[PDB]
Ligand binder design. Structure first.
Ligand SMILES: [Cl-]
Ligand SMILES: [Cl-]
Lengths: 438, 451
């Protein structure tokens, strides 16, 4: 028996926490900027609640009591929360860890316990305003994180259904074909066409029509082009999706995030789940380095719990904080710069021995002034040792107490980086420290 | 949800009333508490959260954010790092209260796992795994026991340092957070395990709750004269000094060592200025098994415990193959009861508790200005202002104003055709109902100044 974190789980070191706090602050400042509420659900539900949901779910031991399970997803707790509280409309964000028992590849992003970061608007509202807002929120956060240039792919579920029927895929092969088409971002169309015809028996005359549609990406001008398409115009659901899309593009143009959006018909994810617009956010090297965010409209899923069977229309977005965390730390790592694990702005030190009690008095005053102060728990620490500690922790200043300095009543402040000393009056010292550090 | 919070409030009120009656409190205060409790009671498929677990409502979250914010600022002020641990650990990792209390996962077809029951065992594992002999950190996370699922707030300092400074700092931090919380007057009681050196201890812990007389009878039932004199006595530094002078305690080295450390600790507290708020009691024996040094427990002044902790050197050593002990001192803050006390206090003021921070809402009385509204709101968002708008083509102005009143939003931005033409925007204070015309450019700056 080795002491280890469970297979698939990880601790978070102070540096990692600092990185995770830095990004969570940006994302939540944006969520609050859009006037969202926040909720929290327990880490486990009753099993009854999750059965019928891929059954890679951790389950607690019976232990006499009724069976329970760690949440594998945020939304089913969301639906339970809305049905339990008799609400059909709410705007909120939930940030919390989820638990799926799957093989974990550390090199790969996969981990058994990982953060999920969701923002949702639920309710019957005029069409597309909430969706446009969701898109704006995605671009705000990714732009603010400064992790390079991003682009957002959007599509619609209805267009996929209509385009696939008109092109000529059967209904039960349709999900499999979609799984193939979605890889066009990471692979080539000759390759997914070979995969489709060869591995899944789809006719080449149906694959080479799906090709003429899916290899097509652009802006609003492509929704107009496809509105003009004779075959597509005939299809009703394709018509619905395109109409919603034309409207969405207009709202984004008002938002000013129009340039960073791309209509792309290759995109096909979460079909079981999404009923309207589907969007994915990816980093740019015009080549995507990975998928950083996702969003969708899922009217069907939220209302499952209600006895009546009423559907609560919902639109939302999920942010891949776990890639964002790694990318941010590596950027720091590439620089090779040390990351502050503490916010201490001053350290109290005395060169001379026997001044420990006085320092304690000084440190307390700083604490009661709301200053982030520290001191070494040694009766007579050496000045050199104290300074090294400051350099390592990134502490900007050192406050030195000396018998000579004390008589004057002044306190000597030395900048660690510049190694320059100034003598300050005790009353002023607090304000001097404040001026020095925000 | 909200109903669940109400139930929690009722459970706390009942406990408080029970404590007050026990303390032989005056009728005037007891009646007020009963009145609050009665009001709470009045206020109070098969979809349900698992037993012992409750959801957090937006209103509930707001109280939690404010409370956590105060605690977090204090921890940061004292220059602590922060660490995170997974929810579950190997069952073997958690081992010698009762083993059965701990939650355990199904076999699955992998190593057996159990949910964290405490936040410090994982910390001990973290230290051993990384081989660290010194760290100052705080950890805020949910713990599971079989409410069964609840938040735990912990601040710990681990390492070898001159005696009593780390211990003194924890008390100062605890006092600092409680005063900041503004939950009223509180006191902290401190004892050392070494000086104290089972069933008597439990009786002793039970002793805090009940009188010595009845308390004395309980001890007899459990079966004392020598023991009784020591337990009743409690106080300050002067009281501490008298005990050392005693010959019996004095001639025992094990007993003697603890007394000396405490004497030293009080001096540090005096420098800090939290000396007045510290109390010495030998009666306290809570968390005796974990502790190898001092005990401290905080009690608010009208379980009844808001904060607790002490020095334990035994745990870090257990994980290490070598078994070398790691000195450590720490504190836990009972943040759930603090949640419900804070929310209750806010309610007394009668001031609204806002679930959102939106500064302003964009609204238009007239028809067909939706696009105009969207552009403006977007500009506000870009500016970093917290703004909203209703997802309606032509919403009515009265409806929008009502939403602001209910949501607590301070201002409403109104767009009119004439206003649009002149370059002005009409800003109306929801509370005052007063209006002003502000040019588009000045709108962002003015909103910030007003808020
Ligand atoms: Cl596949
Ligand atoms: Cl396994």
């Amino acid at each position: 028996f080795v002491l280890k974190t469970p297979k698939g789980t990880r601790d978070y070191s102070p540096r990692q926490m600092a990185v995770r706090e830095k990004v969570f602050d940006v994302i939540i400042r944006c969520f609050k900027r859009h006037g969202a509420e926040v909720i929290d659900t327990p880490v486990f539900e009753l099993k009854e609640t999750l059965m019928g949901k891929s059954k890679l779910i951790y389950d607690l031991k019976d232990q006499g009591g009724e069976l329970l399970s760690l949440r594998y997803d945020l939304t089913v707790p969301f639906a339970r929360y809305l049905a339990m509280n008799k609400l059909t409309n709410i705007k909120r964000y939930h940030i919390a860890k989820v638990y799926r028992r799957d093989n974990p590849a550390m090199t790969r992003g996969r981990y058994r316990e990982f953060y999920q970061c969701d923002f949702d608007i639920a309710g019957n509202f005029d069409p597309m305003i909430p969706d446009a807002e969701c898109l704006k929120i995605m671009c705000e956060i990714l732009s603010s994180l400064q992790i390079g240039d991003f682009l957002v792919k959007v599509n619609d579920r209805r267009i996929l259904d209509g385009m696939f029927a008109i092109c000529g895929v059967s209904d039960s092969k349709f999900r499999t074909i979609c799984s193939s088409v979605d890889k066009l971002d990471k692979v080539s169309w000759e390759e997914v066409k070979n995969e489709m015809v060869g591995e899944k028996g789809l006719a080449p005359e149906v694959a080479d029509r799906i090709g003429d549609y899916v290899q097509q990406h652009g802006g609003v001008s492509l929704v107009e082009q496809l509105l003009q398409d004779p075959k597509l115009s005939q299809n009703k659901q394709a018509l619905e999706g395109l109409g919603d899309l034309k409207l969405l593009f207009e709202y984004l143009t008002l938002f000013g995030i129009d340039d960073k959006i791309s209509f792309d018909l290759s995109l096909a994810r979460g079909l079981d789940y999404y009923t309207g617009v589907i969007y994915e956010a990816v980093l740019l090297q015009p080549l995507g380095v990975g998928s950083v965010a996702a969003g969708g409209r899922y009217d069907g899923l939220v209302g499952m719990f209600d006895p009546k069977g009423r559907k609560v229309p919902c639109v939302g977005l999920s942010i891949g904080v776990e890639r964002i965390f790694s990318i941010v730390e590596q950027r720091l790592e590439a620089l090779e710069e040390k990351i502050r694990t503490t916010e201490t702005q001053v350290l109290v030190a005395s060169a001379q021995k026997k001044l420990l009690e006085e320092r304690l008095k000084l440190v307390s005053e700083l604490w009661d002034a709301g200053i982030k102060a520290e001191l070494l728990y040694k009766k007579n620490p050496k000045l050199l040792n104290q300074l090294q500690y400051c350099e390592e922790a990134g502490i900007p200043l050192v406050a030195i107490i000396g018998e000579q300095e004390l008589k004057d009543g002044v306190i000597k402040l030395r900048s660690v980086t510049s190694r320059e000393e100034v003598d300050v009056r005790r009353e002023d010292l607090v304000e001097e420290i404040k001026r020095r550090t925000g």
